[PDB]
Design a protein around this ligand. Structure first.
Ligand code: NAG
Length: 1400
């Protein structure tokens, strides 16, 4: 090996005297001229073949011949030349006689070949569309570093006066060096974008496909957006456009193809795992490569620390080895950071692609499912496939690799702790084996308690929705406090479960914070006690600690990853069982264009049997009927003959068990269950088509849409709201028919459309759109309908029976032949820093001080424990042994035990404070809302209230405490590392200014932009799920109008808009990570460097402490900025839950100082002193000096035309809104001065709402639970329902469904009647109750009045004048002024407005 570098093999290859053990280090000549030349060449060669395979299988176009790349190839040639120059000189010497070894001829040969390959790679790169190449930049970096070694070597060996350095090879090498420097300087630039670029036209293209290699691996291309986020906000129009590789159009087809292939090779169910692997695996193995490199380099720290400590001990060492070590430490750290975050990028991008592909596949699949499939599940479970499952497949990609990484890191760490610390490391492995059962049990019971929390919060959410709906009823009856207490009890159960979770979380924090210390104590005890000879130097500790600090994470993350793989396995089963469903047959109903003149009837069927399942009783049996072109046919039959199925069959919903059908032309469908999208009514109608003003106006004036818009606020542009804000049944039917009539298709399959419309508007719709002279006069129109008042105007009427077509023919023959239809007719027709203070005050100032104190204790104890381990490592060896071992181990264990006790203390304290604050903020939100006037409920949307009670409160309950823990922990770890550093090597304060204040103000831009981006992401995730719901609901329409491509495209566009926000957030995380990890690596470098500058003073255990802490700052800083961002996002929940604490609340409820007597409703007098109310200040009063002093016991009604205000009469009676003017006095009492409940109780009411609540009917009969079953049944019987009451399973405890759906309409009516009876106050009311209940209930109330309510004054608002006919008096009014009073009969005799209505 020496005959190669020297003729006689003289100049050695590695003489430690020259390279390591000297104050002036320098590689030998053999080394310079073999290995320092074979490193870069070897690199380029090892990366050439695979790089070429890549540039073959990945092109970006072709790049014009620019300048930069010209100069690059020119320098490559000059390098080839100035490298073969050495070879020509070498042969000039060989031939000329001197005996020269192989090296002096083989080195320049390889160098020249590799420079030529550098030129060839530049040209291949240019022809493959690569602007900035990572392989070339790295090759030039390696070459330049090796060349800098060789160049220092030559410069030294030349400056001396003794040796006459060769002028020739030295000149050639100076040349090679300048050229490689310029080539590296030119590898960091970019070329001119390729000339075949197709996405250049996009105004906002992702800045990544055009970014340097340096900007990429440092994610520097998001600095623009992160600074923009600070200077001014980020809306959805600054979000870049997705890379083409991340769009749904270039992601979903590949997964769909692979899935079809797997299924085809199946027809052993298809394994979605194999497909996800075959699709997203190529891009996901690079994650394995980067993670492997990161794992192997995470262990350079501990080893370079072992070397550095051996240095600080060896005080005969040359001062430059400590610098070599500080440099290697810095460089390993920085490579680890870049590699790690490239891996994280790959994983997050692969999860993003998986989610896009899955949402797309699910959506495209729902539109082909056979009806049986969609029945085999619910709509909620088919939308979860998007909402829960795909999110799991997404969030898993980022951790899955730990399955194999965590064991590798733990194994390397154990092997190193062994190689360093002997067979004692079993003492730590034993604690680790006992952390796995605990972590497993805890991760189990955490889910066990989360399930209970969710099942108990869904109940509260349901009750809260019911209350926010029946706000009015509850506010009238005075039932506020009862529902308050019910919801509070459900809350208490939730809180108990959450406290259990708090104990579990406390134990978890104990583990995460005290794993390294427990492991270290076990190891050190077993080591210093199993043998006296064992000495605890600064190298066995402070190298073992590092391995512990980098062992905790694997241990504590492995159980979470296991549980998440399990959850994802369940999700994958669900998703596969969906994507495997049987699909409809596209070719069962064979169609034909509108011009193919084969058959002259738009429809023909031959004995076709149909069914909704594979083996059930076919609903339709042997049909045959051919509807000629344009002929209007109308199928009729008793309910359940097979009517509603002929349409669903022609539309290809059912399964053609046997037969043959064909439909010629474009179809149109108007099913019985109308389907209306969440867009503008006009947008619905046009159904995505070029508006043609004339035809739109026509179709709208046809189906009687004009009288419909007149009420809806904005007109046809009226956004129908949250899935049909206000539209009503007949309205929805008309809108659907408008859609069908606009589409203007050949065959119109009308499925009992006009059913929900009255006879009059119905006949209009027929005559205008369906009739023989309507809009569809020249369309082949079917009609499966009930109303027999049109069949004459028809063309053919078909009737069936139990799925068999009874008889067909014209109405003429239909009547003549006296056939079945004869029977059918004859039968049927027969943050400003105060949010945080508020959260702290809700937790309680004491518990806050306690949490801070216990944190401080934990961390002062940890720090002093480590300074103790240091002072222990510095114990002198006296007589081959270490003194003070007993004392030191005792104190170390004591400090650690105290640390653990304090970590448990503060975790439990912060969690118990979380419980206190959850309880308090919830109670206050509840009380404030329940006190808000009804105005606050009409104005503010129910969405806001439901959101505060669900999500804002979930944040205050189960997210803030954890974030507070992680934030405080990261903050104090950073502060502690900094204390240890500044104390070991005090001349490091000169790094804090230049390194924290100015590169820890990266968090300005991060926090700022990350907030906007998280918002944009969560504001854009619901659209996908709403679309998918709205598509599952109306899939028959979408499938019958041939509008499937449009909807697939809209799903893709929504998924892409969501990704356009999800992608910059991930990259912002990588931005922050690289920046703050660079800061942490600078901390590592500076601590190590100031420990080297000052050896002679520092103590050789202090250095280990300092560097060991420097090696954790790196992760702590990043987690700290992330948790600051989270605290800024989550704390706003405390400002949300406090919104309604200053909103105008209603008047006081109880007034004891002016308390009303027990018999407050003594006389039932009705004094009206020109009172006046107006819904709002801006509007006009609706009571115009209303005046009457009604005596008690009376029985009078209140009637008025539209805009009369009797409704207002009520609203003001109970004081739902304060008195706008005037007065309303009773029994010498100005109700405006009485206590809200002090009056509401004694004034009965039968609100015009049969609204029940989720409870045992007894609850409705008595929410307060202040009524006895005796009088309960007394009412029920008296209430004319006691019979079916006893008919209930639980006589008085028959708990009903939500809203009282288990009771009939008249049922709930009688229910209100009994409510009033039980109340049995002095005075009562019945607001338009006769207009929503048969005469039975109205008359039963009248009988209760003449017999049970005779004593009760009565002012009643009803439209059925007869409902007040026999009443004592009567009054009306308009424009806010009382119209006429006194008896009703005298009114009629007066021929007044009452006489008018009577004429009506
Ligand atoms: C290292 O050792 C050899 C003798 O073993 C000696 O000749 C050589 O000069 C030493 N290296 C240096 C730089 O002195």
């Amino acid at each position: 090996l020496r005959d190669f570098c020297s003729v006689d093999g003289s100049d050695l290859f590695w003489e430690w005297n020259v390279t390591w053990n000297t104050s002036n280090p320098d590689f030998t000549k053999c080394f310079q001229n073999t290995v320092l030349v074979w490193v870069p060449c070897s690199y380029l060669w090892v990366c050439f073949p695979f790089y070429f395979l890549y540039l073959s299988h990945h092109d970006r176009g072709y790049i014009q011949m620019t300048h930069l790349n010209k100069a690059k190839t020119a320098l490559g040639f000059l390098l080839w030349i100035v490298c073969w120059a050495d070879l020509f000189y070498s042969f000039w010497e060989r031939s000329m006689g001197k005996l020269l070894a192989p090296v002096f001829l083989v080195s320049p040969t390889l160098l020249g070949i590799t420079m030529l390959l550098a030129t060839f790679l530049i040209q291949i790169e240019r022809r493959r569309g690569v602007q900035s190449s990572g392989i070339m930049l790295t090759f030039w970096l390696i070459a330049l570093l090796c060349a800098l070694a060789i160049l220092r070597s030559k410069i030294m060996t030349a400056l001396k006066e003794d040796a006459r350095v060769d002028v020739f090879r030295d000149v050639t090498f100076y040349i090679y060096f300048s050229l490689v420097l310029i080539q590296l300087v030119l590898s960091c630039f970019s070329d001119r974008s390729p000339l075949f670029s197709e996405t250049i036209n996009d105004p906002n293209p992702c800045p990544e496909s055009s970014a340097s290699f340096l900007s990429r691996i440092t994610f520097w291309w998001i600095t623009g957006m992160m600074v923009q986020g600070y200077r001014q906000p980020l809306e959805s129009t600054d979000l870049w456009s997705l890379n083409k590789e991340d769009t749904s159009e270039q992601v979903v087809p590949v997964l769909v193809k692979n899935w079809k292939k797997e299924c085809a090779k199946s027809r052993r169910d298809p394994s979605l795992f194999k497909v996800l692997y075959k699709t997203f695996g190529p891009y996901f193995l690079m994650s394995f490569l980067f993670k492997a490199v990161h794992d192997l380099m995470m262990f350079a720290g501990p080893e370079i620390l072992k070397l550095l400590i051996n240095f600080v001990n060896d005080k005969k060492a040359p001062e430059w080895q400590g610098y070599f070590y500080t440099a290697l430490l810095f460089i390993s750290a920085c490579l680890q950071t870049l590699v790690l975050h490239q891996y994280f990028h790959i994983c997050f991008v692969s999860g993003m692609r998986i989610k896009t592909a899955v949402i797309g596949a699910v959506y495209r699949k729902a539109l082909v499912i056979t009806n049986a499939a969609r029945k085999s599940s619910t709509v909620g479970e088919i939308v979860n496939l998007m909402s829960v499952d795909a999110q799991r497949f997404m969030d898993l990609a980022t951790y899955i690799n730990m399955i194999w990484s965590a064991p590798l890191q733990v194994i390397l760490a154990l092997y190193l702790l062994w190689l360093n610390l002997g067979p004692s490391v079993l003492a730590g492995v034993a604690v680790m084996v006992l952390m796995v059962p605990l972590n497993a049990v805890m991760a189990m019971k955490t889910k066990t308690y989360q399930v209970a929390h969710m099942k108990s919060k869904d109940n509260r959410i349901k009750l809260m929705n019911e209350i926010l709906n029946g706000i009015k009823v509850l506010k009238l009856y005075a039932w506020e406090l009862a529902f308050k207490d019910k919801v509070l009890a459900i809350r208490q159960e939730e809180l108990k479960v959450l406290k259990k979770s708090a104990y579990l979380a406390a134990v978890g924090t104990f583990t995460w914070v005290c794993t390294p210390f427990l492991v270290a104590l076990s190891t050190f005890a077993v080591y210093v006690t199993v043998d006296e000879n064992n000495i605890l130097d600064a190298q066995k500790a402070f190298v073992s600690l590092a391995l512990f600090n980098i062992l905790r994470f694997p241990l504590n993350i492995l159980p979470m990853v296991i549980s998440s793989i399990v959850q994802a396995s369940v999700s994958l089963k669900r998703l596969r069982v969906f994507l495997s469903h049987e699909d409809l047959d596209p070719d069962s109903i064979q169609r034909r264009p509108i011009k193919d003149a084969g058959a002259t009837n738009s429809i023909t069927v031959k004995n076709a049997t149909f069914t909704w399942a594979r083996n059930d009783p076919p609903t339709l049996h042997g049909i045959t009927f051919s509807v000629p072109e344009g002929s209007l046919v109308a199928v009729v039959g008793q309910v359940g003959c097979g009517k509603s199925s002929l349409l669903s069959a022609l539309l290809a919903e059912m399964d053609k068990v046997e037969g043959h059908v064909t439909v010629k032309g474009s179809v149109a469908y108007v099913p019985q269950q109308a389907w209306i999208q969440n867009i503008s009514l006009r947008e619905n109608i046009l159904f995505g088509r070029q508006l043609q003003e004339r035809y739109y106006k026509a179709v709208v004036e046809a189906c009687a849409l004009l009288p419909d818009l007149e009420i809806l606020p904005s007109g046809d542009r009226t956004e129908i709201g949250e899935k049909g804000v206000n539209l009503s049944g007949g309205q929805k039917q008309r809108v659907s028919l408008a859609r069908a009539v606009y589409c203007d298709s050949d065959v119109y399959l009308l499925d009992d459309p006009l059913s929900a419309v009255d006879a009059h508007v119905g006949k209009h719709i027929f005559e205008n759109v369906i009739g023989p002279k309507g809009l569809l006069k020249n369309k082949t129109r079917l009609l499966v309908t009930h109303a027999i008042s049109y069949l004459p105007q028809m063309d053919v009427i078909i009737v069936m029976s139990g799925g068999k077509i009874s008889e067909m023919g014209s109405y003429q023959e239909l009547l003549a032949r006296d056939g079945a239809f004869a029977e059918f007719l004859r039968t049927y027709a027969s943050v400003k820093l105060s949010v945080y203070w508020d959260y702290m005050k809700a937790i309680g100032l004491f518990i806050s001080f306690l949490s801070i104190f216990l944190f401080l204790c934990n961390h002062v104890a940890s720090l002093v424990s480590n300074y103790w381990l240091s002072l222990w490592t510095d114990d002198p060896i006296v007589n081959g042994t270490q003194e003070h071992t007993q004392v030191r181990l005792s104190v170390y264990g004591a400090l650690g035990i105290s640390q653990g006790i304090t970590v448990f203390g503060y975790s439990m304290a912060v969690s118990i404070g979380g419980i206190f604050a959850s309880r308090r903020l919830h109670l206050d939100l509840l009380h404030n809302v329940l006190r808000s006037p009804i105005s606050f409920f009409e104005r503010t949307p129910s969405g806001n209230l439901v959101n505060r009670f669900s999500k804002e409160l979930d944040t205050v309950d189960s997210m803030i405490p954890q974030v507070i823990k992680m934030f405080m922990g990261s903050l104090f770890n950073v502060i502690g590392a900094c204390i240890i550093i500044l104390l070991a090597t005090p001349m490091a304060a000169v790094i804090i200014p230049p390194l924290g204040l100015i590169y820890f103000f990266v968090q300005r831009f991060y926090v700022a932009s990350s907030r906007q981006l998280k918002r944009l992401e969560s504001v854009s995730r619901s659209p996908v799920y709403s679309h998918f719901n709205e598509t599952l609901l109306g899939v028959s329409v979408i499938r019958a109008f041939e509008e499937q491509e449009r909807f697939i495209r809209q799903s893709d566009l929504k998924v892409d808009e969501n990704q356009k926000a999800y992608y910059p957030s991930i990259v912002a995380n990588r931005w922050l990570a690289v920046r703050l990890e660079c800061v942490g690596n600078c901390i590592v470098l500076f601590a190590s460097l100031f420990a080297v500058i000052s050896r002679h003073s520092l103590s050789a255990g202090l250095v280990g402490l300092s560097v060991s802490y420097s090696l954790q700052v790196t992760t702590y800083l990043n987690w700290l900025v992330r948790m600051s961002s989270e605290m800024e996002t989550n704390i706003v929940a405390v400002e949300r839950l406090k919104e309604y604490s200053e909103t105008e609340k209603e008047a006081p409820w109880q007034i004891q100082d002016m308390a009303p007597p027990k018999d407050w409703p003594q006389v039932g007098r009705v004094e009206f002193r020109d009172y006046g109310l107006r819904y709002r200040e801006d509007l006009d009063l609706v009571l115009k000096h209303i005046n009457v002093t009604i005596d008690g016991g009376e029985k009078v009604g209140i009637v008025g035309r539209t805009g009369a205000g009797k409704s207002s009469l009520t609203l003001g009676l109970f004081r739902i809104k304060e008195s706008a003017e005037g007065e309303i006095i009773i029994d010498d009492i100005n109700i405006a001065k009485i206590g809200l409940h002090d009056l509401r109780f004694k004034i009965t009411i039968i609100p015009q709402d049969p609204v029940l609540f989720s409870g045992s009917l007894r609850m409705n009969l008595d929410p307060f639970s202040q009524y006895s079953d005796e009088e309960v049944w007394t009412s029920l019987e008296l209430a004319h329902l006691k019979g079916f009451v006893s008919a209930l399973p639980d006589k008085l405890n028959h708990e009903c469904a939500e809203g009282g759906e288990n009771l009939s309409v008249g049922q709930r009516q009688l229910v209100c009647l009994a409510r009033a009876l039980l109340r049995k106050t002095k005075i009562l009311v019945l607001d338009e109750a006769t207009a929503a209940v048969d005469l039975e209930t109205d008359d039963l109330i009248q009988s209760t009045i003449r017999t049970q309510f005779d004593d009760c004054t009565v002012l009643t608002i009803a439209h059925r004048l007869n409902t007040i006919m026999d009443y004592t008096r009567v009054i009306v009014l308009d424009k806010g002024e009382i119209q006429e009073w006194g008896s009703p009969s005298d009114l009629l005799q007066q021929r007044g407005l009452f006489y008018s209505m009577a004429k009506d």
